[PDB]
Nucleic acid binder design. Sequence first.
DNA 1: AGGTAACACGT
DNA 2: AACGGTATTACCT
Length: 201
Amino acid sequence: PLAAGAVILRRFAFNAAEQLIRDINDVASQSPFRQMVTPGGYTMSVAMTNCGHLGWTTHRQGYLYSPIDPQTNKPWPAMPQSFHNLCQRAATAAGYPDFQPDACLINRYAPGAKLCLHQDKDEPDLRAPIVSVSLGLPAIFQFGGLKRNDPLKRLLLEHGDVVVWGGESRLFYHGIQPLKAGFHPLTIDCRYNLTFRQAGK
DNA sequence: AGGTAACACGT
DNA sequence: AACGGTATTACCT
Ligand SMILES: O=C(O)CCC(=O)C(=O)O
Ligand SMILES: [Mn+2]
């Protein structure tokens, strides 16, 4: 096992990938990918957007889940049924049959893009797991512990891989190392990740 | 009190 | 380039 309460389901989303990617494009046509600026004033290397009832965003004052896209000033697009179904099946396979996400953060990684080691704790109900779907180019996922200096596991995540963490491992530090350039026939030159959460009550 | 930015340079 | 400092503070509510 990846950790207590955590598992990787390799190639779980492989068969669903083409549809998922069509729906990413549909979501982004309404709420475009944007590289967000941290409260500290740095532009993130990962480009992001959201779908579902709540979207993760930065602002001057910190991080926030909000029902409105601050760039368009309209609600985030509805969560595609392909996304919701894949998430439900993955969560069930990982031992979290009751998971009901209300938020999906869509990450796009160009070569060089990274996500520094962090915890997912913007969500009030820590009982719900995180379901994380990889698409396109491969990336090295770091998965640690409750403390930043806890030893890291480094796992390659490839197209279609799904990682789920929760319970004892819900607050574990994790991240993505700078993406290697490459080619993938479905995403061409990038990696996408879908991160499903229950962000509200 | 407690929340929490850093989902972001030097060795 | 893997590891860890920084928030060891200065603000909010
Ligand atoms: O891209 C990934 O695999 C991880 C994304 C992530 O950690 C997040 O969106 O909070
Ligand atoms: Mn995360």
